[PDB]
């Protein structure tokens, strides 16, 4: 309902998504974020207008576009201390990108600290005019977005480091546990049409289980790539993915009780904590009381496929490709590692120290955590679950690529002949090895990293330094994104 060209106005004031007044972000005046759209191949410029007073949420801040590529233009794509210095509060900052050949549901959120836990997360979608599944669904609209989200009633850096969520909010509104008379979320649906509901996690944490009482759910795109349509009675959805799904309304004029699970806080739906409801035109305006039926037909990610049916890169068996990476997972001193090194957030962005003219991952800061990949090829990177990383099934996420999930979590089998790609996955608990494949087609760094924000906070990332002798040619910068550096350096700490 606002974009592809737009002011983004952050600021700070209290919220009650779930009946509980608390200090957080607003953008453009409103939480939970505003809804941006656009269609397939439109430029985007986003204004982000930083007015924010308070530094313990942090008066900085700087926007991810999750799932959109970037190429060309890579010091829009967000990270803190990857792709740019943050934008200093009295200032503002203009991301301009296009978004060739993707169409789907993305979200942005901010990508400084733990930032977006405190508010700072809307949902995205991209339409596509030829949408291949165009005539499955007759409404795809800004009422059919559904967002699931954690809430807490202390900030990132009040609560504990790894805290525990008080509510799941569905469209920004949910219960805790004493707030059970707060106010739920309501999609409305009319007998007889058909729906694409577009499900994208907001979460900084916890993965849902996903199911509408009744309904079956037809899930035709994943993290924004086609699928073939796959019908399920669940699914179970990681922080910072996202499904469309079709749901028929056939069923009897009735409130349904849609259920987001979470795997851990407030574990069942005592009092409609953790849900929302389905409203069919004609129902009374009170809650459900249908009952759940157990999930005989779970999504399963290896059973999906991309509509095309499109091979991973590479030859069909493993190491089949120019460079294959294994990311070894732990945990010491209160900081996670990955192949022994723990990420600490430089003080010069990665992409200013290549352009600056630094030349492998040995010059490259933060040491041991940069990874040069070759130009124009196919890489394999596993990311074999343990005990050693607590807090799984961690999901990781890698910018500016969509890979193949040629195995998945709880699944002994590799697939290259058909497997979904996607950009979120989940790496699953100790035994599994999540394996993903990716062409080098986008130079730039691009953080690789678990998007619990908690984990990523306590170090666990690394860069892919993509064809570094081709970063600067390829990705001009604006003399915006110059200044955003020496204008942030010059702050001083309590105004961070
Ligand atoms: C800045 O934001 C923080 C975090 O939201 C606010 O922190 C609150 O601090 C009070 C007073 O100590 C506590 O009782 C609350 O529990 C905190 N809230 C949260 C959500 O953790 C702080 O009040 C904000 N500053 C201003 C001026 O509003
Ligand atoms: C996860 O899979 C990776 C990739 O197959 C395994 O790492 C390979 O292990 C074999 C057997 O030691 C070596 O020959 C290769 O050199 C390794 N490849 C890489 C790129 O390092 C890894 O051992 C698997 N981990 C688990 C727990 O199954
Ligand atoms: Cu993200
Ligand atoms: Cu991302
Ligand atoms: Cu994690
Ligand atoms: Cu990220």
Redesign the pocket.
Known sequence: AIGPVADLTIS?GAVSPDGFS???ILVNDVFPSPLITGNKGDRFQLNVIDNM?????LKSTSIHWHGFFQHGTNWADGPAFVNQCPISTGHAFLYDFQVPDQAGTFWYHSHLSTQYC?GLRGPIVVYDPNDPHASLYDVDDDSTVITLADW????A???APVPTADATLINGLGRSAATLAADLAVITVTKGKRYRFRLVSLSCDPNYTFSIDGHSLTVIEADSVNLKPHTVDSLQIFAAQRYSFVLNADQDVDNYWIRALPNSGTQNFAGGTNSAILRYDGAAPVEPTTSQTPSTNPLVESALTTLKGTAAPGSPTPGGVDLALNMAFGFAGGNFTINGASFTPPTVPVLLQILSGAQSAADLLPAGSVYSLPANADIEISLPATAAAPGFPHPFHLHGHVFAVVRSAGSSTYNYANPVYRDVVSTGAPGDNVTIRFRTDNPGPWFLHCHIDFHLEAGFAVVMAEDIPDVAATNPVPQAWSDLCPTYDALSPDDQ
């Open positions: 700070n608390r200090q957080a007073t308070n530094h313990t949420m405190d807490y009633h202390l900030a850096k009040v609560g």
